[PDB]
Structures are given as C-alpha cells and as structure tokens.
Structure 1
Amino acid sequence: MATLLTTDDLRRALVESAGETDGTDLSGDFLDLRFEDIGYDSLALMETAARLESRYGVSIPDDVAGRVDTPRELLDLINGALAEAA
C-alpha cells in the first residue's frame, strides 16, 4: 500500500542528515526554496533521500534526481513513485 509521507516527516528527516548547531530552522517554508539555498549540496542530500528510501522501501531514479530543484518536486517524485509501487 502506497503510504504517502507528509511534509512533516520530510522536514525532520532533512534535519537528521546534518547535526544540531550546523543547520538552519526549517520552519515557515522550505518547499519553494532551493537545496543550494539551504546549504545542501548533493552528498548530504542523498543521505536524506536514502533515509526515506530505506524506510518506505523505494529507490530514487538517477536521471530524475536532476529534476528536483526544490523539496516540493522531490516530494512529488517520492509520492508518485509510491503510487506506482501499489
């Protein structure tokens, strides 16, 4: 069953990939903002991705990783892939 995750869980899991006194306050919004904009490259970002992949049992496609500028689009990607996994 496709268990679509919420934006709350995503927010929290994005924090786990950094530490404590090295991150910003993910509050208000983080969906219409960029990853470069929040001090995330790719490496630390894939850690966040794998955090979710392993939990829901998914796998992120390679070409499609270059289609997410915003967390907004990343959420659609995972939500959509879940829907096709049934």
Structure 2
Amino acid sequence: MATLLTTDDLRRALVESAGETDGTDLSGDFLDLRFEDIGYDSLALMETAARLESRYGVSIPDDVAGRVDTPRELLDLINGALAEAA
C-alpha cells in the first residue's frame, strides 16, 4: 500500500509546533481533540502541516490547512494525498 503517515508521524510534527519547540505531547486520543481544545494556533498548524508536506510530498493549501479543526482531518488529507501519490 502507499506509505501513509501514522499517528506517531503526525503527533511528532504536532508536538513540536504545539508550543515552544516541542510543547504539547498529545499522548492520547489527540485525533478526537480539536486544535482549539489543545491550545493550538493555526500558525503552528501550518508549520506542522508544511513539514509533513515537504517531507513526504503532499500539498495542503493555507485555506485547507487552517481549516482542519481536528488532527484526524490533517491525517485524512495526507491520507488522500499520499495514497494517491506514487
């Protein structure tokens, strides 16, 4: 199958932008925790997304990235992107 990001991959990028260079661990069901509820700013969200984007080869526009209220959506986007990438 296409190599999709796991929740560990997602979480790693997530944690590091979440605060002061690794700020919020998100060890638990972070997909069910909305960014607003985890003290997340969408700038950190952009920073997180762009890292994954540039590292694995996906494209998530500003309007779309700053519109993924839940982390499962970010991985959903990357799922649809990476699985359809060769």
TM-score norm. by structure 1 comes to 0.80
- The alpha-carbon distance between structure 1 residues 65 and 19, as it changes in their structure 2 partners (threshold 3 A), is closer
Tell me how large the CA RMSD over aligned residues is: 2.4
Name structure 2 gaps, 5 residues minimum: none
Q: Secondary structure, in 3 states, of the residue corresponding to 1:24?
A: coil
Larger radius of gyration: 1
Q: Deviations over 1:35-84 (max 9, x none)?
A: 11111111111000011001101111344335522101111111111122
- The alpha-carbon distance between structure 1 residues 33 and 23, as it changes in their structure 2 partners (threshold 3 A), is same
- How far apart are 1:4 and its partner, in Å? 0.6
- How far apart are 1:2 and its partner, in Å? 3.3
Identity of aligned residues (%): 100
For structure 1, which segment, 61-70 or 25-34, has the greater mean C-alpha deviation from structure 2 after superposition?
Answer: 61-70
Name structure 1 gaps, 5 residues minimum: none
Count of aligned pairs: 86
**Inter-partner Cα distance in structure 1 for 2:36 and 2:81:** 24
1:7-86 mapped onto 2 (5 Å cutoff): 7-18=7-18, 23-65=23-65, 67-86=67-86
- How far apart are 1:32 and its partner, in Å? 0.6
**Inter-partner Cα distance in structure 1 for 2:38 and 2:62:** 22
